[PDB]
Amino acid sequence: VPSLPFLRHLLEELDSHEDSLLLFLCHDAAPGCTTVTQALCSLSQQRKLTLAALVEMLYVLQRMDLLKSRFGLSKEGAEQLLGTSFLTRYRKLMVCVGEELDSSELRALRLFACNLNPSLSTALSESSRFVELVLALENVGLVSPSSVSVLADMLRTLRRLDLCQQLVEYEQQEQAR
C-alpha cells in the first residue's frame, strides 16, 4: 500500500544494526537480497509490503518514534497489527532475543556454535550479530523455524534460562499449531 519512495525515505532513518535486523526479518520473503532497498523492492513486487508489515518491522525494531511520525501510531496502536503480515513468529523472536544479549554473551554463543560445529568458524567472526549466528546455524541445518532447541541449549549453557525458555515455549507453540 505505502509507496516505495515513501518507504525508502523511511529507511534512511535506520542505522546499520537496524538494517541488518530488517534484512534478517526479510530473509524468507526476499531471497538473495543484500541491501534493505533490495528487500523492500522485492516485497513490493510480491504485494507483501503492506502497512501492517511496515508497522510490524518498526515495532520489532522498537522505533516508536517512526511509528508515530509516519503512521500516527502509538505502541498500542502498532500492537494491534502484529501477526498480520508475512513476518513470522520465528524471525521476530530471533531479533528480540538477540537484543537481550550483550557482547560477551554473543561471543560465548558464537564459541558454543563453533565448538558444536567447527565449520561455522568461517561463517562467524568477532563482529557477527545474533541474527548472523542464527542464519549461520540455519544454513547448516542446525536450526529452522520448526526447531530451535540447539539455540535454546546454547542459551541454557550461557545460564540465560529466561531466553532459553522463550525458545522452548516458541518451539512447543509452533509444533501445536
93 & 9 share domain = no
Task: Give the experimental resolution in Å.
Answer: 1.4
Tell me how many domains the chain contains. 2
61 & 127 share domain = no
Instruction: Print the domain residue range for 93.
Output: 85-177
Amino acid identity for residue 165 in this structure:
Q
46 & 78 share domain = yes
Of 46, 124, 132, 116, the closest CA to residue 85 belongs to 46
Structure determined via: X-ray
Q: Are 136 and 120 in contact (CB under 8 A)?
A: yes
Of 58, 65, 76, the closest CA to residue 22 belongs to 58
Domain final residue, candidates 48, 69, 84: 84
Task: Dihedral sign for Cα 26, 101, 120, 16, please.
Answer: positive
Maximal C-alpha separation, the chain: 48
Domain final residue, candidates 84, 106, 130: 84
131 & 99 share domain = yes
d(CA 96, CA 86): 17
CATH number at residue 19: 1.10.533.10
104 & 64 share domain = no
Q: What is the DSSP letter of 145?
A: T
95 & 74 share domain = no
Q: Are 157 and 135 in contact (CB under 8 A)?
A: no
170 & 101 share domain = yes
102 & 21 share domain = no
d(CA 52, CA 56): 6
Domain final residue, candidates 65, 84, 103: 84
DSSP for 16-53 reads HHHHHHHHHHTTTTSTT--SHHHHHHHHHHTT---HHH
DSSP for 80-136 reads TTTTSSS--HHHHHHHHHHTT--HHHHHHHHHHHHHH-GGGGGT--TT--HHHHHHH
74 & 124 share domain = no
170 & 90 share domain = yes
157 & 121 share domain = yes
d(CA 64, CA 50): 18
Listed as own residue / partner, the contacts of 133-141 with beta carbons closer than 8 Å and 24 or more positions apart are 133/106, 133/109, 134/24, 134/94, 134/98, 135/24, 135/27, 137/113
77 & 93 share domain = no
